[PDB]
Amino acid sequence: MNDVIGFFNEREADLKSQYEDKKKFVKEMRDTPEFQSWMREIRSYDQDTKEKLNKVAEKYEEEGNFNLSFVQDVLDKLESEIAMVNHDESAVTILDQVTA
Amino acid sequence: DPILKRTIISKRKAPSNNEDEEIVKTPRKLVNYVPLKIFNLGDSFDDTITTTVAKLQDLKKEILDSPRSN
Amino acid sequence: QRQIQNACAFCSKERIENVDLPDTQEEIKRELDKVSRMIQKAEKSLGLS
Amino acid sequence: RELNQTSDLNERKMLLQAKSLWIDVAHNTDACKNLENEISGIQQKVDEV
Amino acid sequence: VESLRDFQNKKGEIELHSQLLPYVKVKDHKEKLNIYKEEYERAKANLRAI
């Protein structure tokens, strides 16, 4: 029993260390640099409250829930729109004197 | 308060306690290395086809060095 | 050695370390997708392969 | 000449994909080094036994 | 002209997730916070039991 109690003491010490590691992971999960990036995106949105932004946000929410995705759908749409804008502004310097 | 922020945000009590596998951690082999990791992301576009493309690029540059016309 | 043989087949591995690029694999995958898309755009502008 | 213009971007895609392959090689090598350290520690324990 | 209009639509779509909090990042942060909290809870329960 002295052997088994020493073994259980070292096992509970290892469990305590793992619990401390999990607490550290929880602490670093919050107060992240991305968390720092937040609360000023809210300020940027508050510079331009609702109105057209609310409507386009509602449309975006409808698109997102219809797509049944929130990460892959957003990345795919970003890639598609970047590929679209890659071929842009073709002979856009002149529009009027040609008509004249 | 806008319904947008609350819909975008995720309620903390929404998950069903996030119950883990079985009752304890799954048994593991004493080594159980299994390195694998042959591919690390990327993939998609193959490298051999564009390798032939680059070879053709240097070949056509060498051709451009050779005289053309006149 | 299979990977390094592929790298030495694709130009050279030792000429790679001098070039600068973020080490994150996700960023490199995004860049690869971006260059694939712009290559597709150039191809469709040319029309012919 | 248009193909040369496109092939500049094609060889840029070469640079990106080769960087990806070399970083994969680096990850494999450092994981192999970690495995070597682990087996060295296990061999030290075996020597103690 | 239509490509410029579609680029304006694209920039609006970008601002949609940019002006507000990043939806992908906030969802990932919520998920990781949930899993870390449940792991912490089970670890502390096991610690109390032992």
GROMACS .gro file of C-alpha atoms in nm:
model
  318
    1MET     CA    1   0.000   0.000   0.000
    2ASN     CA    2   0.289   0.241   0.056
    3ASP     CA    3   0.391   0.181  -0.306
    4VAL     CA    4   0.036   0.227  -0.433
    5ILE     CA    5  -0.020   0.545  -0.229
    6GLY     CA    6   0.306   0.692  -0.360
    7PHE     CA    7   0.191   0.600  -0.710
    8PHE     CA    8  -0.147   0.767  -0.654
    9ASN     CA    9   0.027   1.075  -0.514
   10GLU     CA   10   0.238   1.106  -0.829
   11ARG     CA   11  -0.072   1.040  -1.044
   12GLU     CA   12  -0.266   1.317  -0.869
   13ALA     CA   13   0.036   1.547  -0.906
   14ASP     CA   14   0.029   1.478  -1.280
   15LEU     CA   15  -0.346   1.545  -1.283
   16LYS     CA   16  -0.285   1.873  -1.099
   17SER     CA   17  -0.024   1.970  -1.359
   18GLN     CA   18  -0.266   1.887  -1.642
   19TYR     CA   19  -0.538   2.092  -1.472
   20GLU     CA   20  -0.297   2.385  -1.442
   21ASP     CA   21  -0.214   2.350  -1.812
   22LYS     CA   22  -0.586   2.354  -1.896
   23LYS     CA   23  -0.632   2.665  -1.681
   24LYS     CA   24  -0.344   2.830  -1.869
   25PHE     CA   25  -0.507   2.734  -2.199
   26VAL     CA   26  -0.836   2.886  -2.083
   27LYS     CA   27  -0.659   3.205  -1.977
   28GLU     CA   28  -0.476   3.238  -2.309
   29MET     CA   29  -0.800   3.163  -2.495
   30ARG     CA   30  -0.924   3.499  -2.368
   31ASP     CA   31  -0.743   3.834  -2.390
   32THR     CA   32  -0.609   3.727  -2.730
   33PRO     CA   33  -0.463   3.971  -2.984
   34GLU     CA   34  -0.777   3.896  -3.185
   35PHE     CA   35  -0.981   3.986  -2.877
   36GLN     CA   36  -0.782   4.310  -2.883
   37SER     CA   37  -0.876   4.352  -3.250
   38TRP     CA   38  -1.236   4.333  -3.129
   39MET     CA   39  -1.420   4.619  -2.952
   40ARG     CA   40  -1.286   4.854  -3.223
   41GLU     CA   41  -1.459   4.672  -3.506
   42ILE     CA   42  -1.768   4.748  -3.297
   43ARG     CA   43  -1.655   5.112  -3.287
   44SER     CA   44  -1.610   5.114  -3.665
   45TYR     CA   45  -1.963   4.979  -3.707
   46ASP     CA   46  -2.089   5.238  -3.456
   47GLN     CA   47  -1.943   5.514  -3.674
   48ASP     CA   48  -2.203   5.406  -3.933
   49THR     CA   49  -2.509   5.284  -3.743
   50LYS     CA   50  -2.774   5.060  -3.906
   51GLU     CA   51  -2.975   5.195  -4.204
   52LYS     CA   52  -2.824   5.053  -4.527
   53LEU     CA   53  -2.566   4.856  -4.328
   54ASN     CA   54  -2.844   4.690  -4.128
   55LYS     CA   55  -3.022   4.590  -4.450
   56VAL     CA   56  -2.709   4.449  -4.615
   57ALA     CA   57  -2.623   4.269  -4.290
   58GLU     CA   58  -2.970   4.112  -4.288
   59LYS     CA   59  -2.916   4.003  -4.648
   60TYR     CA   60  -2.575   3.860  -4.554
   61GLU     CA   61  -2.734   3.670  -4.265
   62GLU     CA   62  -2.997   3.529  -4.500
   63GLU     CA   63  -2.724   3.421  -4.743
   64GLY     CA   64  -2.520   3.263  -4.465
   65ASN     CA   65  -2.804   3.064  -4.311
   66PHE     CA   66  -2.925   2.962  -4.658
   67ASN     CA   67  -2.572   2.846  -4.743
   68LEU     CA   68  -2.567   2.645  -4.416
   69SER     CA   69  -2.204   2.750  -4.369
   70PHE     CA   70  -2.010   3.027  -4.196
   71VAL     CA   71  -1.640   2.964  -4.269
   72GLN     CA   72  -1.610   2.768  -4.593
   73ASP     CA   73  -1.888   2.973  -4.753
   74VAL     CA   74  -1.728   3.304  -4.651
   75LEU     CA   75  -1.383   3.200  -4.773
   76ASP     CA   76  -1.529   3.069  -5.100
   77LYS     CA   77  -1.718   3.393  -5.160
   78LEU     CA   78  -1.405   3.596  -5.081
   79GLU     CA   79  -1.200   3.390  -5.327
   80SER     CA   80  -1.470   3.418  -5.595
   81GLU     CA   81  -1.499   3.796  -5.558
   82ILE     CA   82  -1.120   3.837  -5.562
   83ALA     CA   83  -1.098   3.629  -5.880
   84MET     CA   84  -1.379   3.841  -6.027
   85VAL     CA   85  -1.210   4.172  -5.941
   86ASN     CA   86  -0.878   4.043  -6.078
   87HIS     CA   87  -1.011   4.116  -6.429
   88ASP     CA   88  -1.141   4.470  -6.376
   89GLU     CA   89  -1.097   4.820  -6.520
   90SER     CA   90  -1.052   4.719  -6.884
   91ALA     CA   91  -1.036   5.035  -7.099
   92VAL     CA   92  -1.228   5.221  -6.827
   93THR     CA   93  -1.022   5.539  -6.870
   94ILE     CA   94  -1.248   5.661  -7.152
   95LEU     CA   95  -1.628   5.629  -7.164
   96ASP     CA   96  -1.757   5.964  -7.291
   97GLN     CA   97  -1.550   6.094  -7.583
   98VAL     CA   98  -1.598   5.762  -7.764
   99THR     CA   99  -1.974   5.818  -7.743
  100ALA     CA  100  -1.934   6.180  -7.857
  101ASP     CA  101  -3.024   4.640  -2.908
  102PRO     CA  102  -2.973   4.515  -3.271
  103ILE     CA  103  -3.077   4.152  -3.338
  104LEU     CA  104  -2.763   4.137  -3.555
  105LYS     CA  105  -2.509   4.131  -3.271
  106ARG     CA  106  -2.699   3.868  -3.072
  107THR     CA  107  -2.751   3.646  -3.377
  108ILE     CA  108  -2.385   3.676  -3.477
  109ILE     CA  109  -2.268   3.608  -3.122
  110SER     CA  110  -2.286   3.253  -2.986
  111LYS     CA  111  -2.456   3.181  -2.655
  112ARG     CA  112  -2.225   3.013  -2.405
  113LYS     CA  113  -2.494   2.774  -2.275
  114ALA     CA  114  -2.599   2.667  -2.626
  115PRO     CA  115  -2.364   2.363  -2.641
  116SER     CA  116  -2.495   2.053  -2.464
  117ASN     CA  117  -2.221   2.054  -2.198
  118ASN     CA  118  -1.973   1.941  -2.468
  119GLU     CA  119  -1.955   1.587  -2.334
  120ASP     CA  120  -1.627   1.414  -2.418
  121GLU     CA  121  -1.570   1.065  -2.556
  122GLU     CA  122  -1.694   0.777  -2.336
  123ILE     CA  123  -1.621   0.835  -1.966
  124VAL     CA  124  -1.242   0.883  -1.972
  125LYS     CA  125  -0.964   0.941  -2.224
  126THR     CA  126  -0.943   0.677  -2.495
  127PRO     CA  127  -0.668   0.414  -2.452
  128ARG     CA  128  -0.352   0.476  -2.652
  129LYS     CA  129  -0.050   0.264  -2.740
  130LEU     CA  130   0.264   0.328  -2.537
  131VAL     CA  131   0.437   0.469  -2.848
  132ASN     CA  132   0.168   0.518  -3.115
  133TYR     CA  133   0.378   0.762  -3.316
  134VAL     CA  134   0.232   0.722  -3.667
  135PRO     CA  135   0.419   1.016  -3.827
  136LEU     CA  136   0.243   1.019  -4.167
  137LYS     CA  137   0.208   1.393  -4.245
  138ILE     CA  138   0.303   1.331  -4.609
  139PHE     CA  139   0.109   1.642  -4.715
  140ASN     CA  140   0.071   1.955  -4.501
  141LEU     CA  141  -0.213   2.163  -4.650
  142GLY     CA  142  -0.149   2.297  -5.001
  143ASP     CA  143  -0.229   2.010  -5.240
  144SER     CA  144  -0.476   2.137  -5.508
  145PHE     CA  145  -0.248   2.240  -5.795
  146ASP     CA  146   0.002   1.972  -5.893
  147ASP     CA  147   0.372   2.052  -5.910
  148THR     CA  148   0.478   1.826  -6.200
  149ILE     CA  149   0.253   1.993  -6.459
  150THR     CA  150   0.380   2.339  -6.368
  151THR     CA  151   0.731   2.190  -6.360
  152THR     CA  152   0.690   2.097  -6.725
  153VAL     CA  153   0.549   2.448  -6.771
  154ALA     CA  154   0.862   2.606  -6.619
  155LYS     CA  155   1.087   2.382  -6.828
  156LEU     CA  156   0.899   2.496  -7.138
  157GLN     CA  157   0.937   2.854  -7.014
  158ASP     CA  158   1.316   2.834  -6.998
  159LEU     CA  159   1.319   2.647  -7.330
  160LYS     CA  160   1.114   2.920  -7.500
  161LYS     CA  161   1.340   3.184  -7.345
  162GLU     CA  162   1.639   3.002  -7.496
  163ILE     CA  163   1.452   3.000  -7.828
  164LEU     CA  164   1.395   3.376  -7.788
  165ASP     CA  165   1.772   3.405  -7.756
  166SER     CA  166   1.805   3.241  -8.098
  167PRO     CA  167   1.738   3.476  -8.393
  168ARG     CA  168   1.381   3.507  -8.521
  169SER     CA  169   1.275   3.657  -8.856
  170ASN     CA  170   1.500   3.881  -9.073
  171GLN     CA  171   1.410   1.193  -4.904
  172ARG     CA  172   1.109   1.156  -5.134
  173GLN     CA  173   1.011   1.516  -5.055
  174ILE     CA  174   1.364   1.648  -5.100
  175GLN     CA  175   1.398   1.457  -5.428
  176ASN     CA  176   1.075   1.620  -5.545
  177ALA     CA  177   1.214   1.959  -5.440
  178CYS     CA  178   1.541   1.897  -5.626
  179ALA     CA  179   1.334   1.791  -5.926
  180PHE     CA  180   1.130   2.113  -5.897
  181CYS     CA  181   1.429   2.345  -5.951
  182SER     CA  182   1.622   2.311  -5.621
  183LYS     CA  183   1.554   2.299  -5.248
  184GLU     CA  184   1.864   2.497  -5.150
  185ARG     CA  185   1.763   2.797  -5.364
  186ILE     CA  186   1.439   2.816  -5.165
  187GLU     CA  187   1.553   2.930  -4.818
  188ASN     CA  188   1.669   3.269  -4.951
  189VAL     CA  189   1.316   3.357  -5.069
  190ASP     CA  190   1.090   3.506  -4.801
  191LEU     CA  191   0.736   3.378  -4.736
  192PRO     CA  192   0.528   3.329  -4.419
  193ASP     CA  193   0.579   2.987  -4.261
  194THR     CA  194   0.208   2.932  -4.192
  195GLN     CA  195   0.072   2.661  -4.421
  196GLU     CA  196  -0.276   2.816  -4.439
  197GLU     CA  197  -0.138   3.144  -4.576
  198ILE     CA  198   0.068   2.956  -4.835
  199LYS     CA  199  -0.237   2.752  -4.938
  200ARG     CA  200  -0.437   3.074  -4.976
  201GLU     CA  201  -0.157   3.221  -5.187
  202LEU     CA  202  -0.149   2.906  -5.402
  203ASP     CA  203  -0.524   2.930  -5.456
  204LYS     CA  204  -0.487   3.300  -5.542
  205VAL     CA  205  -0.212   3.238  -5.797
  206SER     CA  206  -0.409   2.948  -5.945
  207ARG     CA  207  -0.711   3.176  -5.986
  208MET     CA  208  -0.506   3.452  -6.149
  209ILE     CA  209  -0.338   3.197  -6.379
  210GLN     CA  210  -0.687   3.082  -6.477
  211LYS     CA  211  -0.780   3.446  -6.543
  212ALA     CA  212  -0.473   3.493  -6.763
  213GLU     CA  213  -0.554   3.170  -6.949
  214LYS     CA  214  -0.915   3.272  -7.012
  215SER     CA  215  -0.797   3.615  -7.129
  216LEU     CA  216  -0.566   3.433  -7.371
  217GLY     CA  217  -0.836   3.172  -7.433
  218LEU     CA  218  -0.590   2.910  -7.556
  219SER     CA  219  -0.381   2.695  -7.322
  220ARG     CA  220   0.548   3.743  -7.567
  221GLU     CA  221   0.207   3.726  -7.402
  222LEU     CA  222   0.302   3.374  -7.292
  223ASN     CA  223   0.621   3.512  -7.136
  224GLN     CA  224   0.409   3.766  -6.950
  225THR     CA  225   0.186   3.484  -6.822
  226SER     CA  226   0.485   3.260  -6.746
  227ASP     CA  227   0.630   3.524  -6.515
  228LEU     CA  228   0.324   3.465  -6.297
  229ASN     CA  229   0.350   3.090  -6.361
  230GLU     CA  230   0.706   3.087  -6.225
  231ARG     CA  231   0.583   3.300  -5.934
  232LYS     CA  232   0.343   3.012  -5.865
  233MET     CA  233   0.652   2.791  -5.888
  234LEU     CA  234   0.818   3.003  -5.621
  235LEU     CA  235   0.513   2.977  -5.393
  236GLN     CA  236   0.461   2.601  -5.438
  237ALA     CA  237   0.833   2.532  -5.393
  238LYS     CA  238   0.829   2.736  -5.072
  239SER     CA  239   0.535   2.524  -4.957
  240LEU     CA  240   0.718   2.200  -5.040
  241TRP     CA  241   1.036   2.317  -4.865
  242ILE     CA  242   0.841   2.418  -4.553
  243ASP     CA  243   0.677   2.075  -4.557
  244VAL     CA  244   1.028   1.927  -4.576
  245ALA     CA  245   1.133   2.143  -4.281
  246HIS     CA  246   0.832   2.028  -4.078
  247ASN     CA  247   0.913   1.665  -4.157
  248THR     CA  248   1.277   1.716  -4.059
  249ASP     CA  249   1.197   1.884  -3.728
  250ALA     CA  250   0.941   1.615  -3.643
  251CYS     CA  251   1.208   1.356  -3.726
  252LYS     CA  252   1.446   1.540  -3.493
  253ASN     CA  253   1.182   1.533  -3.219
  254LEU     CA  254   1.139   1.159  -3.274
  255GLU     CA  255   1.517   1.120  -3.257
  256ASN     CA  256   1.524   1.306  -2.925
  257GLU     CA  257   1.240   1.089  -2.793
  258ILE     CA  258   1.413   0.766  -2.897
  259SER     CA  259   1.740   0.896  -2.750
  260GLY     CA  260   1.566   0.953  -2.417
  261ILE     CA  261   1.405   0.609  -2.435
  262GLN     CA  262   1.746   0.458  -2.514
  263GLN     CA  263   1.893   0.641  -2.214
  264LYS     CA  264   1.619   0.487  -1.999
  265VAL     CA  265   1.703   0.149  -2.154
  266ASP     CA  266   2.069   0.204  -2.064
  267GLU     CA  267   1.966   0.287  -1.708
  268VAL     CA  268   1.767  -0.037  -1.695
  269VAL     CA  269  -1.888   4.930  -6.590
  270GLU     CA  270  -2.054   4.612  -6.464
  271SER     CA  271  -1.719   4.487  -6.333
  272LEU     CA  272  -1.685   4.810  -6.134
  273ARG     CA  273  -2.038   4.761  -6.000
  274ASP     CA  274  -1.956   4.402  -5.902
  275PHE     CA  275  -1.635   4.525  -5.738
  276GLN     CA  276  -1.846   4.766  -5.534
  277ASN     CA  277  -2.067   4.472  -5.437
  278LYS     CA  278  -1.754   4.276  -5.341
  279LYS     CA  279  -1.624   4.560  -5.124
  280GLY     CA  280  -1.965   4.580  -4.957
  281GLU     CA  281  -1.951   4.206  -4.887
  282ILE     CA  282  -1.600   4.247  -4.745
  283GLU     CA  283  -1.714   4.534  -4.522
  284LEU     CA  284  -2.004   4.314  -4.408
  285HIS     CA  285  -1.766   4.087  -4.217
  286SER     CA  286  -1.503   4.360  -4.169
  287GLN     CA  287  -1.710   4.646  -4.026
  288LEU     CA  288  -1.865   4.407  -3.775
  289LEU     CA  289  -1.668   4.149  -3.578
  290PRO     CA  290  -1.508   3.877  -3.796
  291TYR     CA  291  -1.774   3.607  -3.806
  292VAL     CA  292  -1.531   3.322  -3.876
  293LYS     CA  293  -1.295   3.437  -3.601
  294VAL     CA  294  -1.569   3.500  -3.346
  295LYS     CA  295  -1.726   3.160  -3.412
  296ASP     CA  296  -1.389   2.985  -3.382
  297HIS     CA  297  -1.315   3.174  -3.059
  298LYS     CA  298  -1.653   3.076  -2.915
  299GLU     CA  299  -1.599   2.710  -3.006
  300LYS     CA  300  -1.249   2.698  -2.859
  301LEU     CA  301  -1.368   2.878  -2.545
  302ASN     CA  302  -1.648   2.623  -2.505
  303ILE     CA  303  -1.416   2.325  -2.545
  304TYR     CA  304  -1.156   2.475  -2.310
  305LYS     CA  305  -1.423   2.550  -2.049
  306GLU     CA  306  -1.562   2.196  -2.062
  307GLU     CA  307  -1.211   2.050  -2.040
  308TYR     CA  308  -1.140   2.273  -1.739
  309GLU     CA  309  -1.466   2.165  -1.575
  310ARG     CA  310  -1.399   1.793  -1.620
  311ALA     CA  311  -1.038   1.835  -1.504
  312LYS     CA  312  -1.142   2.018  -1.187
  313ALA     CA  313  -1.413   1.759  -1.119
  314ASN     CA  314  -1.156   1.480  -1.150
  315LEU     CA  315  -0.917   1.673  -0.926
  316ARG     CA  316  -1.184   1.716  -0.659
  317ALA     CA  317  -1.275   1.347  -0.683
  318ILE     CA  318  -0.915   1.229  -0.638
   0.00000   0.00000   0.00000
